[PDB]
Design an enzyme around this catalytic site. Sequence first.
Site, short mmCIF file in Angstrom:
data_model
loop_
_atom_site.label_atom_id
_atom_site.label_comp_id
_atom_site.label_asym_id
_atom_site.label_seq_id
_atom_site.Cartn_x
_atom_site.Cartn_y
_atom_site.Cartn_z
N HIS A 1 -30.39 92.89 29.49
CA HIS A 1 -29.18 93.34 30.17
C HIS A 1 -28.25 93.71 29.01
O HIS A 1 -27.91 92.87 28.18
CB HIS A 1 -28.58 92.21 31.00
CG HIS A 1 -29.41 91.83 32.17
ND1 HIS A 1 -29.51 90.53 32.64
CD2 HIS A 1 -30.19 92.58 32.99
CE1 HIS A 1 -30.31 90.50 33.69
NE2 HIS A 1 -30.74 91.73 33.92
N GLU B 1 -24.96 91.63 27.75
CA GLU B 1 -25.10 90.28 27.21
C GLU B 1 -25.38 90.37 25.73
O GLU B 1 -26.50 90.17 25.27
CB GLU B 1 -26.23 89.57 27.95
CG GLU B 1 -25.96 89.53 29.43
CD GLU B 1 -27.15 89.03 30.22
OE1 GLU B 1 -27.14 89.23 31.45
OE2 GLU B 1 -28.08 88.46 29.60
N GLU C 1 -30.08 81.06 29.28
CA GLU C 1 -28.74 81.50 29.64
C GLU C 1 -27.88 80.70 28.67
O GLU C 1 -27.58 79.53 28.91
CB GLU C 1 -28.42 81.10 31.08
CG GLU C 1 -29.09 81.99 32.12
CD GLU C 1 -28.59 83.42 32.07
OE1 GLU C 1 -27.48 83.64 31.55
OE2 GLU C 1 -29.30 84.33 32.57
ZN LIG Z 1 -29.19 88.34 31.87
#
Ligand SMILES: [Zn+2]
Lengths: 309, 319
Positions: free
Chosen positions: A53, A56, A211
């Site tokens: 992504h 990020e 994450e």
């Molecule tokens: Zn992500």
Amino acid sequence: SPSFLQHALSSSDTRAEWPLPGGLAARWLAPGCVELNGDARGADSVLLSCGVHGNETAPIEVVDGMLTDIAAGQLALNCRLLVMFANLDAIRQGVRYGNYDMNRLFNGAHARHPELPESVRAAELETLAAEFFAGARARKLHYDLHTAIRGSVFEKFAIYPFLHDGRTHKREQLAWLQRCGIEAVLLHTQPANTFSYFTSQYCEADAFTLELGKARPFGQNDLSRFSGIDGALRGLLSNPQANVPDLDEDKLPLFRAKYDLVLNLADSVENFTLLPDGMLIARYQATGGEERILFPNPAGIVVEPARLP
Amino acid sequence: THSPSFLQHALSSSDTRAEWPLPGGLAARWLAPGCVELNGDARGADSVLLSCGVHGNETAPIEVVDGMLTDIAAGQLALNCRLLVMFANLDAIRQGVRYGNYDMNRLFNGAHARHPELPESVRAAELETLAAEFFAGARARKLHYDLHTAIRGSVFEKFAIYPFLHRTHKREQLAWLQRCGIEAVLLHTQPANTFSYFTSQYCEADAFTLELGKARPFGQNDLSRFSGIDGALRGLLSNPQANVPDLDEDKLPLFRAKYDLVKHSFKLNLADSVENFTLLPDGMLIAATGGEERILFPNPAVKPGLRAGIVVEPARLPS
Ligand SMILES: [Zn+2]
Ligand SMILES: [Zn+2]
């Protein structure tokens, strides 16, 4: 030039080879994909993917800094290492994705959207990873690095593709993660169209989606807030044989999804928000007082505390 | 004189609210048809509620309970707890049927109100009230074992159903159940109209539904196959303070409902006689799967808009 990321976002070359200290070399196998010390016959193999992504950027900057140090001789590399700056167009534009979420096109899903440039990319990344891990003769590790806009009760957490009842499970990995700063782990046995599921199931690698925190544009990340992952990854590449100080499970809560398809929560509701007993749409209803909502979007999953078995 | 069998007295309804002397100056009080309280005045003693015959065709537990009562009245067995015995569905027992008009174990938790025109509903309400008054006087432990047997066999011969708890699940009782013969426990995740749910929730007691084996008419029960529950029960009434040999959760598998098999319009890919808790291999499913699920209470005959079976999955305790 000394910046791997800069080169990856322009593709100045394509398959060139950069000389590295210690007789090593950095080989660009494809746009935004660089392999270092790939000839390391029996060393551990590490796949670091970031920028799946484009918004990020913290993990991207972290990974680029490590590569720089390897090239400068400041950081030793004793693992076969493959770094992938995933969604190049998204990273260059600073957006989540162009036409479709790439972390939903993996596990072969890209075949359902063969026209999307991101699908073509995802397919190419699957093959590269597959070929990279096929040459591994020691540990096979994959950390897909993410950050997120939505807040979370557990700021840093991991998603663990638990497969085959954990017959090839490594608690040392859970220990390593807890040492990285991971505050919680989400276990799932069911298939998913994510890069970590793909490598876990197809390449038989110990793969995890991490994450690591808050999504921010480049230049706005507090790399200090990523010292844990930064230190741990550097230590892994430097000396992969370093022992891991077990894992005090008491401080590493494990969760699992009980049912998906889960509206009655604020738009900015945080990941892992506990749902009180007797709540409409946790019609799905909350019970027990230990269930938590994850990845909400009106479409979300309800998770519960889990235990290894 | 009166019948030496508490059960026969209840069926033959010799009296109604008579009291029988028990060895040791104790007494057995008939509180209603088929309901008898023994050593009720024992203050500070653990309180035990044993109900059987909720389904009239499940006689094995009935004979085991009746045998214990006869031994107590004979002086063969000692009683040191407040004991209430309930021969639940008398009419069904006398007729040898599961139920006459409606399944009584679907009429508890207040569900009897929906069918006030049914004698089984009036009886269910009476049993709730009696149980409530019985446990209200309890000062020590409150224990309820609703004893059942069944026609359909099971992978886990003897198993228990743990009512939905709104403390969590007490493992001290799971231990007693384990070292009793129970080979598996189903933990309910939603309220039910069962007697064990009613006592657990309304009377807040430690209540369980016990499936002890095969259903058979009177005289055809191999009371030997019920030695475990029989000895464990006789031991509870005599010496209820005997500690339980801990609980090795690694030997007592627990389960919870995963999802129901909603039926509409339809084919059940399992033999009509498939046993309960039959393991479902990874692959066959409804149209998720992991070789961990099992089928429970299959009933493809209903085919209405309701469920025709329940898929259960392994359940783990917090500790
Ligand atoms: Zn992500
Ligand atoms: Zn029954």
